Amino acid sequence: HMERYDIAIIGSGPAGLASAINAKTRKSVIVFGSSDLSKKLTLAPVINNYLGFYGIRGAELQEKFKEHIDNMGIQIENVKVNNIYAMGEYFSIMTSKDTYEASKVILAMGMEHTKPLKGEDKFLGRGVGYCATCDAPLYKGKIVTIVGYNKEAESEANYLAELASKVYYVPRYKDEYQLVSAVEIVKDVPVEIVGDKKVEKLKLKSRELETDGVFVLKDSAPPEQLVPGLYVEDGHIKVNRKMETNIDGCYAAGDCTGKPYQYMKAVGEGQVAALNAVEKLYTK
Amino acid sequence: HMERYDIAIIGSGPAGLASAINAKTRKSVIVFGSSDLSKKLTLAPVINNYLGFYGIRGAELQEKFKEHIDNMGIQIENVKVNNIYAMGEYFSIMTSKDTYEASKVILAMGMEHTKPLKGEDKFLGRGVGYCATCDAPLYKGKIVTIVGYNKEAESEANYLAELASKVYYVPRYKDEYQLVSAVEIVKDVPVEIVGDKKVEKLKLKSRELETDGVFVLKDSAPPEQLVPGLYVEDGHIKVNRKMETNIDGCYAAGDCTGKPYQYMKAVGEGQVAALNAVEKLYTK
Numbered sequence A, B: 001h002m003e004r005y006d007i008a009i010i011g012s013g014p015a016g017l018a019s020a021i022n023a024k025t026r027k028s029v030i031v032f033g034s035s036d037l038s039k040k041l042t043l044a045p046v047i048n049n050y051l052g053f054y055g056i057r058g059a060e061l062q063e064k065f066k067e068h069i070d071n072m073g074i075q076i077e078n079v080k081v082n083n084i085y086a087m088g089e090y091f092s093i094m095t096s097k098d099t100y101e102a103s104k105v106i107l108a109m110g111m112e113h114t115k116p117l118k119g120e121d122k123f124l125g126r127g128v129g130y131c132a133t134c135d136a137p138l139y140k141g142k143i144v145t146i147v148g149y150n151k152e153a154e155s156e157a158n159y160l161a162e163l164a165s166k167v168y169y170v171p172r173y174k175d176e177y178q179l180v181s182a183v184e185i186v187k188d189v190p191v192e193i194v195g196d197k198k199v200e201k202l203k204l205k206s207r208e209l210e211t212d213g214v215f216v217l218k219d220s221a222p223p224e225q226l227v228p229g230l231y232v233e234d235g236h237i238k239v240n241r242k243m244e245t246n247i248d249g250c251y252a253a254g255d256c257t258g259k260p261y262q263y264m265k266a267v268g269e270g271q272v273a274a275l276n277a278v279e280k281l282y283t284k
């Protein structure tokens, strides 16, 4: 069904966990993200600029962070947040599973490193989107191509196969893929989304797919799509010294706020966002 | 004599150490402060909001920070910084011992918690000051009272006893005091600095001292006195998202920049300041 919380934290990396441990000062808090917290932490080899942990390996620091949240009774809700609608005094939070409401939101999604595909921006809203399940009814009986950058994208492909006339899945990571037989896996490199007034084809290095929709599925939609009305410049969510965005009650912390992309900056921002959000909840 | 460095960090607490470990990316760096890093860290009992160190004691976290800087060959220069003069393209740094020049400065002095004495602001520049050794020639053959909040203040009293006709030392901490016999220790509580056009007396709870100067000696002068021309509001050094102050080449990080006074905020700010300072050194 629906569940209400005082604070929702969108991301489970350094920034979101820093927010969570500072918000547990009560005030219900929910943290959305991945079971493994942050993929970048796991991939980091030796870390020498996180003060107090000289020479730690990324996966070791990840475990220290996991034990911290576990000691404080903080769990990660393992769902993808698709859209956050600023209703004015609260936020409606749409996810890959259930819908939530929260009084305050802390954006902590990190920063996407991969570039958009050619034609992606051009056809946005004319056949390109960032949430396949959200737009699924629009593609009933149509051809849909999903360019998947994470495992959740596979679930969206499976769902779309129940409505679309044909589903192609283009993986952008190496794994076994848990897809129903109706999904055609296209192990090729996307080149360009093309069309006249709307999407007509996805061109790949060795193949072209006639398709009505192309969904580009990453850990998070671009922030201005995830949070309609949010002020972003240069792909960075713009915040002030209190980590406040342009949307009252919506904060942002970590790589999603701009450079430098470092752990200490991220945890500091998460702390500031959470303490300010809590203050606003007690002052109304 | 004088020594030149690319970056000078003013403070050895969480913020300054975070700056130091991020600036050692070369670029000579000098860190001014106390041997014990930060007094607040030592006094902190259990810390649960420093991500990755759940349940750590303050002195334990202090030791982790000490081992980090030691592993990176970062030493603390154990002197008090008295004044930083923005010369335009560099900074002249006056200390309780030698003078330094630095291309970039990172202010990391923390935030003073004790309030000013009554009359302190009123007589500033008319008998009240924050550096006794700096103003010592002005008090040759005059009466000087030092209200000392740290051990360095004792050294300043000893120096002033060579020039002033009479030196009183009013300690604001419990310890043995290493003072020459010419210094009179006044174990009483300051109440008010009084005078007409200039300082004439220090009133204490049980005694009044006729005095020509009153020096209030804390770990650092107020930031607008430490750094002439620095923009401060509400006792907080005002910085932007890059930790830049109003003075080009001068950054600030940690409690000295405003609330919340927390460790994660401080280390994040120190990191941002240092990485920006380094960038400016490589771009000129």
Ligand SMILES: Cc1cc2nc3c(=O)[nH]c(=O)nc-3n(C[C@H](O)[C@H](O)[C@H](O)COP(=O)(O)OP(=O)(O)OC[C@H]3O[C@@H](n4cnc5c(N)ncnc54)[C@H](O)[C@@H]3O)c2cc1C
Pocket: A010, A011, A012, A013, A014, A015, A016, A032, A033, A034, A036, A037, A038, A039, A040, A041, A043, A044, A045, A046, A047, A048, A049, A050, A079, A080, A081, A082, A108, A109, A110, A111, A219, A220, A221, A226, A253, A254, A255, A256, A260, A261, A262, A263, A264, A266
């Ligand atoms: C190989 C490598 C080495 C690095 N080494 C260092 C180093 O030595 N020192 C250093 O300071 N920095 C280092 N970094 C950078 C550092 O990892 C980042 O600055 C830091 O991880 C930022 O954390 P964050 O919480 O802002 O974002 P992230 O760490 O990206 O966390 C984001 C998390 O939120 C989840 N999420 C995002 N959007 C949504 C959504 N819509 N719904 C649900 N969940 C979502 C993601 O799945 C992810 O788990 C390194 C990065 C890499 C890639």
Ligand SMILES: Cc1cc2nc3c(=O)[nH]c(=O)nc-3n(C[C@H](O)[C@H](O)[C@H](O)COP(=O)(O)OP(=O)(O)OC[C@H]3O[C@@H](n4cnc5c(N)ncnc54)[C@H](O)[C@@H]3O)c2cc1C
Pocket: B010, B011, B012, B013, B014, B015, B016, B032, B033, B034, B036, B037, B038, B039, B040, B041, B043, B044, B045, B046, B047, B048, B049, B050, B079, B080, B081, B082, B108, B109, B110, B111, B219, B220, B221, B226, B253, B254, B255, B256, B260, B261, B262, B263, B264, B266
């Ligand atoms: C009892 C107590 C418990 C606390 N518990 C927590 C907690 O659980 N979690 C949390 O997040 N925060 C806590 N805090 C607050 C936290 O300690 C501060 O936010 C943090 O120490 C800020 O560090 P900083 O580097 O900005 O300043 P500081 O820690 O004050 O470091 C300043 C250092 O620079 C030196 N210095 C200053 N001026 C000069 C100068 N002119 N020349 C030379 N050296 C100078 C000082 O001697 C000092 O050593 C606590 C504070 C106290 C007092």
